[PDB]
Swiss-Prot record, chain B:
Protein name: Large ribosomal subunit protein eL38A
Superkingdom of source: Eukaryota
Location of this chain's protein in the cell: Cytoplasm
Keyword Cytoplasm set for record: yes
Pfam families noted in UniProt: Ribosomal_L38e (PF01781)
One annotated GO biological process: protein-RNA complex assembly
Subunit structure and binding partners: Component of the large ribosomal subunit (LSU). Mature yeast ribosomes consist of a small (40S) and a large (60S) subunit. The 40S small subunit contains 1 molecule of ribosomal RNA (18S rRNA) and at least 33 different proteins. The large 60S subunit contains 3 rRNA molecules (25S, 5.8S and 5S rRNA) and at least 46 different proteins.
Family assignment from sequence similarity: Belongs to the eukaryotic ribosomal protein eL38 family.
This protein's encoding gene: rpl3801
Curated annotation (Swiss-Prot), chain C:
Record GO biological process: cytoplasmic translation; rRNA processing
Keyword Coiled coil appears in the UniProt entry: no
Remaining remarks: There are 2 genes for eL30 in S.pombe.
Name the record gives this protein: Large ribosomal subunit protein eL30B
Full-protein residues shown: 34 to 114 of 117
Curated annotation (Swiss-Prot), chain D:
WD repeats by residue range: 13-52, 68-98
Family: Belongs to the WD repeat BOP1/ERB1 family.
Record's subunit section: Component of the NOP7 complex, composed of erb1, ppp1/nop7 and ytm1/SPAC890.04c. The complex is held together by erb1, which interacts with ppp1/nop7 via its N-terminal domain and with ytm1/SPAC890.04c via a high-affinity interaction between the seven-bladed beta-propeller domains of the 2 proteins. The NOP7 complex associates with the 66S pre-ribosome.
Places the protein is found: Nucleus, Nucleolus; Nucleus, Nucleoplasm
Gene (UniProt): erb1
UniProt protein name: Ribosome biogenesis protein erb1
Functional note: Component of the NOP7 complex, which is required for maturation of the 25S and 5.8S ribosomal RNAs and formation of the 60S ribosome.
From Swiss-Prot, chain E:
Listed SUPFAM superfamilies: Translation proteins SH3-like domain
Name of protein: Large ribosomal subunit protein eL27A
Gene transcribed to yield this protein: rpl2701
GO biological process per UniProt: cytoplasmic translation
One GO cellular component term: preribosome
Source organism of this protein record: Schizosaccharomyces pombe (strain 972 / ATCC 24843)
Keyword Cell membrane attached: no
Similarity comment text for this entry: Belongs to the eukaryotic ribosomal protein eL27 family.
Pfam families the record matches: KOW, Ribosomal_L27e
Compartments reported by the entry: Cytoplasm; Nucleus
Keywords: Cytoplasm, Nucleus, Ribonucleoprotein, Ribosomal protein
Length: 87, 70, 66, 98, 129
RNA sequence: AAUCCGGUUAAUAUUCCGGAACCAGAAGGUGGAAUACGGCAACGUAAAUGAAGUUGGAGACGUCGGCGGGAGCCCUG
């Protein structure tokens, strides 16, 4: 409850909506950046651009995790290619 | 309540049927506030120039309900 | 003599540009950093000490015993 | 500025990127130069009346300009006195459309 | 001509070829920049059962010419060079979007010819992640 | 998921009145773009295809102590 002063000079206790929690990254678990921090229902009206980043896997994982995943995939591909050539 | 600072847009808003009535309130600062109530928002335009306000009142659509200061 | 660029950005800047002549990646360094250094070393025939300063990226040797 | 923040009208005459647009300081005309080599000339009358919206219509479409490296009209200048357009191309040629 | 991959920005995980290197530094990019043209939309797996218009639509590829830093890029062992890919990369094309658009159109046409000829298959095929 | 003010009774108010908004859902209509974008970057825009299948976040989280920010009450010119 939040106490406020009415224009009629009356003290009114008004309900306070719970602060929205920003979405968390899928891999790291840290909250995502560049998106509003509101309730799940409130964020629905936002557009796709306002809800997802302009990057691969944007809106589900952090950019640092994305770079790490890209690097890990490249290293795995190189190792698999070398292993295939050796075999 | 969405204040509008574009005179042409207000005239266009009055041109469309979305407008219901327009109230011209005379403030203490001698500024004419042309408040037009639409279906989804209240359009208020404050014009300090009396001649501009007089021109706006004269150029208002006939269908619009012009209201004096309440 | 062979000033080290040990760290995260300095080591990567020296290694990627080829400035780091000798690299001593310790066990505490990230495996991705070691793998990227291995990829960089393979592309330029660099010296990888690979020590068992997270990654000692020496720009040169000079008086170094290596 | 008195109509809306959004543009009052839009045009896509140029087949290439619209390089620049110029409005004559005195003559009620505007010119637009683009890398397509075609320059569009429009005549626009603006009235101070609230109910009189700006009436802008195209007047001419300049053509026959050389295009080099996908670049045509680069700089367009209007005469300070008459409705004369000075357009400089990528080849160093300046056309004065009087 | 060296094949490179972009691990940053919107064009993440996209293979590019260095048409003109700006690693020496520039006022616009005070770093090891590199203006390269890559492929964003890899051509689809065209089937002989599909129609000629269907085959071309699937085989259509969307190129992308951009300048990125050396750190943002990743060198690769493979490399592809084209006659039309040399000398067409310059600051004027970057400065003039119409020149850039023609550069993108020409690069896509060259890539489409490369895809049609069956060359640069690894580059033409999008990389998984 | 989504509403406040002022006024109104013998006994009623976030319900009634006057004024001003918000939510959800629904179709078609208009206009805009459409046949997505720039920055090394975090990120940003009026729009900016996505089946099956796969994944994640929020919802949805233990307790205590001190500090900072604000509000109100009280105090005071």
């Amino acid at each position: 409850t939040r106490i406020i002063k009415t224009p009629g000079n009356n003290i009114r206790y008004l309900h306070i909506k719970k602060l929205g929690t920003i979405p968390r990254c899928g891999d790291t678990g840290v909250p995502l950046q560049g998106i509003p921090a509101l309730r799940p229902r409130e964020f629905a009206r936002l557009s796709h651009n306002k809800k997802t980043v302009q990057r691969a896997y944007g809106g589900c994982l952090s950019a640092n995790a994305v770079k790490d995943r890209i690097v890990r995939a490249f290293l795995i591909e190189e190792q698999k290619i070398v292993k295939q050539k050796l075999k | 309540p969405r204040q509008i600072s574009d005179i042409k847009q207000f005239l266009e808003i009055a041109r469309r049927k979305d407008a219901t009535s327009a109230r011209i309130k005379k403030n203490t600062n001698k500024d004419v506030k042309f408040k037009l109530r639409c279906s989804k928002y209240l359009y208020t335009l404050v014009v300090a120039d009396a001649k501009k306000a007089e021109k706006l009142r004269q150029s208002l659509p006939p269908d619009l309900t012009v209201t004096e200061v309440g | 003599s062979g000033k080290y660029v040990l760290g995260y950005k300095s080591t990567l800047k020296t290694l990627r540009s080829g400035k780091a002549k000798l690299i001593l990646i310790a066990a505490n360094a990230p495996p991705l950093r070691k793998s990227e250094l291995e990829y960089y070393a393979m592309l330029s025939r660099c010296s990888v000490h690979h020590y068992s300063v997270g990654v000692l990226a020496v720009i040169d040797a000079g008086d170094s015993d290596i | 500025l008195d109509f809306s923040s959004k543009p009052y009208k839009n045009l896509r005459y140029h087949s290439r990127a619209l390089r620049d647009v110029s409005y004559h300081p005195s003559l009620p005309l505007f010119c637009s130069g683009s890398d397509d080599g075609d320059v569009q000339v429009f005549h626009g009358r603006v009235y101070s009346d609230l109910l009189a919206n700006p009436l802008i219509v195209p007047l001419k479409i300049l053509r026959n300009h050389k295009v080099v490296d996908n670049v045509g009209v680069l700089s367009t200048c209007w005469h300070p006195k008459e409705a004369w357009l000075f357009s400089a191309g990528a080849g160093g040629e300046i056309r004065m459309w009087t | 001509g060296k094949v490179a991959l972009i691990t940053r920005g919107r064009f993440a995980g996209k293979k590019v070829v260095i048409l003109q290197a700006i690693d020496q530094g520039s006022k616009s990019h005070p770093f090891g920049h590199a203006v390269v043209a890559g492929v964003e939309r890899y051509p689809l797996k065209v089937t002989k059962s599909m129609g000629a218009k269907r085959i071309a639509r699937r085989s259509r590829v969307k190129p992308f010419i951009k300048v990125v830093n050396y750190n943002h890029l990743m060198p690769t062992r493979y490399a592809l060079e084209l006659d039309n890919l040399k000398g067409l990369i310059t600051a004027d094309t970057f400065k003039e979007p119409t020149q850039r658009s023609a550069a993108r159109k020409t690069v896509k046409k060259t890539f489409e010819e490369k895809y049609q000829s069956g060359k640069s298959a690894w580059f033409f095929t999008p990389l998984r992640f």
